[PDB]
């Protein structure tokens, strides 16, 4: 019960085969969630190269709504995986606690679950055993998908046992005898999760199990009047028993209900002694253009910043700005230099205040007269 620097507390639960325990870091006081995987139950091959493939594959899938995996510790008896811990419990327990939820919170959970399944589909992995008991809540009321790799190994081994244990969560293809589910189970499972977030109950519930399989094969479900008819078209386009008409991520991303309150970070791109390293500093601004145009570019830059400047030469410009909060004014002087016929250098020079005990700072306001100019010039 000690891995890394983590002691293990009381076991939370044993859902299918994995023993999930809370881990605690004695030094830093941080709560992690370890998962024990007995090799007796579901492991056929014991080659360490498979564990190396696990270490290479599973760690690099970083997403703000997927439970991140930290390391997979090997053991002669078991397999330990340190997933992150969240104190908000399962989604199904939250549904059983609060009943029917508001639409604005159900869409907020549904967008996060769909953007956690879209990250998996972009990174070529599916979550076949998706359910409200395998999505957790954090302290900040978000949605966290528990696993992606764990279902894939299990579903191939015992698809019939998984279907017998829960028919409603299992896909119509799996009960119809299709070999591999693929991503078509993911949108249908996110649809029954959306029906749980909109109505509280389960859409496909029976006591007698082959009649429940017949209810899965039937494309009908219950619909109350508590929910608006703008989302029932999405539910009918999402919960089809035939995967030819089942909704895609694009077919939800072009739907009207899904685009109402959508955060931008969910979808990345829509249209697509001492040792010190020496530094190479420059002098001014090196612009390879005409000298009559660089002064106009400097003019266009300093006109936007509301400065008060005068000239002496055609390339000697003594600028002066009044600070908003500080009553005094700061002065400096720009000058153009010719290092070669191609490039021209813009040199800054400060001048000292002679008589006035000005507050604030002298040279830091001098750098404030330049850090607003470099950004606008961008050269």
């Amino acid at each position: 019960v000690k891995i890394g620097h983590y002691i293990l507390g009381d076991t939370l639960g044993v859902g299918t085969f994995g023993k999930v325990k809370v881990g605690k870091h004695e030094l830093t006081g941080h709560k992690v969630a370890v998962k024990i995987l007995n090799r007796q139950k579901i492991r056929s091959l014991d080659v360490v190269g498979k564990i190396r493939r696990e270490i290479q594959n599973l760690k690099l899938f970083r997403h703000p709504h997927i439970i991140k995996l930290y390391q997979v510790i090997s053991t002669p008896s078991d397999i330990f995986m340190v997933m992150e811990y969240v104190s908000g419990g399962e989604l199904f327990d939250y549904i059983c606690k609060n009943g029917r939820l508001d639409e604005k919170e159900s869409r907020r959970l549904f967008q996060q679950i769909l953007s956690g399944v879209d990250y998996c589909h972009r990174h070529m992995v599916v979550h076949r055993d998706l359910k409200p008991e395998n999505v957790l809540l954090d302290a900040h009321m978000n949605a966290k998908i528990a696993d992606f790799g764990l279902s894939n190994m299990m579903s191939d081994g015992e698809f019939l046992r998984t279907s017998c244990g829960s028919p409603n969560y299992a896909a119509p293809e799996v009960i119809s005898g299709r070999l591999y589910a693929g991503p078509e189970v993911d949108i249908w499972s996110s649809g029954v999760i959306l029906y749980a977030l909109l109505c509280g109950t389960l859409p496909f519930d029976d006591d007698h199990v082959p009649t429940l399989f017949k209810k899965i094969c039937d494309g009908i479900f219950y619909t109350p009047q508590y929910l608006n008819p703008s989302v029932i078209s999405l539910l009918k386009h999402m919960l089809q028993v035939d995967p030819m008409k089942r909704a895609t991520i694009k077919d939800i991303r072009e739907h009207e209900w899904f685009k109402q309150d959508l955060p931008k970070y969910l979808f990345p791109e829509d249209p697509s002694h001492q040792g010190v390293r020496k530094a190479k500093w420059h002098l001014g601004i090196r612009s390879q253009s005409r000298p009559n145009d660089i002064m106009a570019e400097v003019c266009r830059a300093i006109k936007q910043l509301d400065y008060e400047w005068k000239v002496v030469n055609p390339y000697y410009l003594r600028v002066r700005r009044k600070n908003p909060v500080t009553s005094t004014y700061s002065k400096m002087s720009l000058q153009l230099y010719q290092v070669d016929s191609r490039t021209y250098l813009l040199d800054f020079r400060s001048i000292d205040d002679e008589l006035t005990p000005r507050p604030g700072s002298h040279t830091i306001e001098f750098f404030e007269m330049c850090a607003n100019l470099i950004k606008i010039l961008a050269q």
Partner: antibody
Amino acid sequence: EVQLVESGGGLVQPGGSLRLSCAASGFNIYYYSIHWVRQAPGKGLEWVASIYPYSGSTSYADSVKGRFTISADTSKNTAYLQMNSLRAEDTAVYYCARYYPYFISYYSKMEAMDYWGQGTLVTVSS
Amino acid sequence: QMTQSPSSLSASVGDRVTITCRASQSVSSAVAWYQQKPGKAPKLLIYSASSLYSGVPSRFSGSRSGTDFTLTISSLQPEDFATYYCQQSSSGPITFGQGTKVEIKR
């Protein structure tokens, strides 16, 4: 219950544009990349085209680069291989096949072609 | 961008054959094996060159030795007489093998 019925085959004139389809029935075409292959009589398989609708990225073999515009229609679950400027050598039977690029297991990134169609025979002759 | 090169052979019923596939460049474990009966559709046998596709039984087995992918057929039934195809899929372009045919011993 997955069947990949090809259509649009037959016999064409060289220098004529053909567009053969693949009615993907039994799954969703937006996730899986429909791949076409070339099977010359007596020779082996040869990959020609690919379109992946989920990321919107295609692929092409070096011998058919930029000449066979592949297209996929997710609304009718078809895959349109619009061939253009075909040579006399391009005379084969064209099978249709779905492609599963996903992690089937923790250790195995499956990258095979599961379900194959019957394949229509196109014959090019002057 | 690369090429493939299988072997070619012929053996009897129940014999244990092997088919190598020398990859040109360095690829991962992403090589499949397709059984095509003459005048039929190519059936998939082993997807990642080491693990068995669901369906066809455990007679077909594959081993990986660097960039030399193998296909071993133990206990050759009298129904598994067809043409076998190596298939590289890890890179951008997909290149099939030349295709080995298995003939009954006579």
